[PDB]
């Protein structure tokens, strides 16, 4: 009924009403698509690439209009990449309460006025059924493969555990069966941070003139390392200061100055509101709730998988990777990339996560 | 010429003008102490005992008066104990920079108001010179041995390398040669979380009746996840809600609830402007600065010293204990001591790390 945009170009896909979870119904739901290959005649050639918690759809190419930099993970799809856009049709959606064209806290809602603090709570789980609705308003009914790391692996479990006859394989990278202990008390702190600004203003601040700024730098600079690996941040900053500063009288230390960029980075790209809404989603984050555990449910999934797991990870330990390959009866067994660069390295190791694409993508084809 | 207070009790030490190592000079300085077992007829047997971040004096016995909650190292110190008071003489200082005795932020100023933003940056070897000055003030001018872990270890190799002579073991316990970059960053952001507070107010909160309790809050939740093991916490708390609370209807998760708490642990015993002025003596480690560096300073110390580190151990990881017993001549090589509790693990394995300590006590013997 409706149609994937043009390569490179925006679409914003009408989905409708949405119900969630909660019970609650979210009306006028709209999430933003991209997409790079052709659509095969019979719309069996899809892999969707799930962003993670800041991303949204331009996962390849270079800064432009409409995008101040390039993809999030530039290069995974094209002519020849690990996502052969020659023989595939990469589709990556902005996902449901997020701030980059899907319906989020700062977009605007029938009133007239932004959601806001009218936003509800929403699961990884809603977020994928956003994402099916939004491929079904475009014919879309059946996918090859679906690849994520982090939050987008999240998203990758749910949409094969929870749609295994419309999902032909998966690819679910740096992610856990469930959020840890570890991760909900960094990011339950990461949310306190933001709300403890007082621009905050109940999460309804937008169009004030005033933001939360200092808080989600805050978040940002925490969440950050979480994402890094230890060794390596201590090679490339060490105690080193910022230039010519003197933290002994009030400078900064050049990892210091390093975290206040990365915060900067984000503010310019990224609204507070859609920060928390997201991140009380991978608190919520649970394969197993109401389905009898997770051993219960990933035990019950057929899909074929491939899962991997970085060997320096601290927000999303390789045990967490092992528990998905132990459980999984569609995966042959843990895929170990070896990398320094921690959680980051899924999206840096390009060669070692470029053979995981493949065979994901190798099993889409032999079903 | 001052007294070592009796057995238990707080005694308050008048130290006198200290110069600080960026020339600034702090008048009327005083260092809270506490001491345990009698002190020998030559004065000799001192076993410094150092304590970390948020530490004070009182480092064994129950709570009581002045005393709210048991000592931070309950037991270690005692009859029969791995500082044995029937032979050993421990005492404890307050750091300088504190809120428990000491001369810190909170403490009152010549002019009667509180030092406040006029509290001089201070390093951990400025730290030393005020334990240092102490001692002496009491007629005790060479220790036997000097004991810490976390920032009590940074402490306690400062004490080594610096006072060579006048020392005769040390125990180094989960630290560092230096501040690593991931120390610095997860640091200076707790700082900008208390300073982020409104009111903070530039650090001169104290008669106000208003203090930056929220920014402390987050500071010492994010410090708190840095001292815990990823598996222990999961194991603990898992993603389990705070008793009958709905977090996906605005409830706290387990293990967000237990952080709340330790937070408010904190506010009702810890001082903000210490909580800045200490982890920013922190950042400023490093025993190599006006050495040489790192190897240099630490090859040219022969003190005999016990180095332990945790396995699991994720703010001073087990490399840079490493570091130091390759560098140490006077270390036989790393004690890995065994632990899933990470940094806290010293705390908490009493017999594997009681077993160094009376190594340590051993080698302050032969000597
Ligand atoms: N892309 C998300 C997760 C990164 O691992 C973010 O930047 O926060
Ligand atoms: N918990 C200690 C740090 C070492 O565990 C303190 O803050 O005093």
């Given at each position: 009924?409706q149609?994937?945009?043009?390569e490179?170009?925006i679409?914003?896909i ?5 119900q969630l ?9 709209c999430?933003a ?6 659509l ?6 899809v ?6 918690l800041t991303?949204d ?5 270079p800064?432009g209009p409409?995008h101040?930099?390039?993809g999030?993970?530039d290069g ?5 990449a690990?996502?052969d856009?020659?023989?595939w049709?990469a589709?990556?959606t902005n ?12 977009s605007?809602?029938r009133?007239?006025?932004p959601?806001g ?8 789980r809603?977020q ?7 491929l079904?308003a475009?014919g879309?009914?059946?996918?090859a493969?679906?690849?994520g790391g ?9 949409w ?5 006859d419309?999902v032909?394989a998966?690819l679910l990278?740096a992610?856990?069966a469930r959020?840890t202990a570890?991760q ?16 905050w203003?109940?999460?309804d601040?937008?169009?004030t003139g005033?933001?939360?700024?200092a808080?989600?730098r ?5 969440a ?6 230890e060794?390596?941040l201590?090679?490339r900053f060490?105690?080193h ?9 009030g ?10 960029h990365?915060?900067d980075?984000?503010?310019?790209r990224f609204?507070?509101?859609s920060?928390?809404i997201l991140?009380?989603?991978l608190?919520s984050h649970?394969?197993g709730?109401?389905r009898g555990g997770?051993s219960?449910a990933?035990?019950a999934?057929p899909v074929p998988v491939?899962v991997?797991?970085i060997?320096?990870?601290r927000?999303?330990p390789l045990?967490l990777?092992?528990?998905?390959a132990?459980?999984?009866?569609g995966?042959?067994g843990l895929?170990v ?6 959680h ?7 060669e070692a996560?470029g053979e995981?694409?493949?065979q994901?993508?190798?099993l889409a084809?032999?079903?």
């Open positions: 009924t149609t994937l945009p043009a490179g170009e679409g914003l009408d989905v409708g009403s949405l979870e909660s019970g609650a119904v979210i009306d006028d739901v999430i698509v991209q997409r790079w290959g052709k095969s005649p019979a719309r069996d050639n892999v969707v690439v799930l962003h993670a991303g759809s331009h996962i390849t190419g800064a409409g101040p930099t390039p999030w993970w995974v799809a094209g002519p020849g690990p996502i856009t020659t023989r049709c589709v990556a996902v449901l309460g997020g701030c980059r064209g899907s319906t989020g806290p700062s605007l809602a009133d007239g006025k959601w603090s009218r936003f509800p709570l929403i699961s990884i809603d994928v059924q956003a994402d099916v609705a939004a079904a475009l879309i009914t059946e996918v493969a679906v690849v982090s939050m987008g692996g999240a998203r990758a479990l749910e094969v555990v929870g749609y295994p419309r032909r998966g990278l992610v856990g959020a570890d909900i008390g960094t990011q339950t702190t990461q949310i306190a941070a933001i709300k403890a600004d007082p621009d203003q109940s999460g601040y937008h169009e005033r933001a939360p700024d808080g989600l805050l978040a940002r600079r925490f950050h390392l979480t994402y890094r690996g060794i390596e201590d090679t060490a105690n200061n910022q230039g010519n500063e003197d933290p002994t009288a400078g900064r230390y050049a990892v210091q100055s390093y975290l206040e990365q915060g980075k984000l503010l310019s609204d507070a509101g920060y928390v991140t009380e989603a608190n649970d394969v709730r109401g997770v219960a990933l035990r999934c491939v991997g797991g060997t320096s990870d927000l999303y045990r990777q092992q528990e998905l132990d459980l999984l009866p995966c042959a895929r990339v070896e990398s320094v660069y921690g980051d390295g899924f999206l840096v190791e390009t996560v995981l694409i493949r994901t993508l190798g084809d032999r079903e």
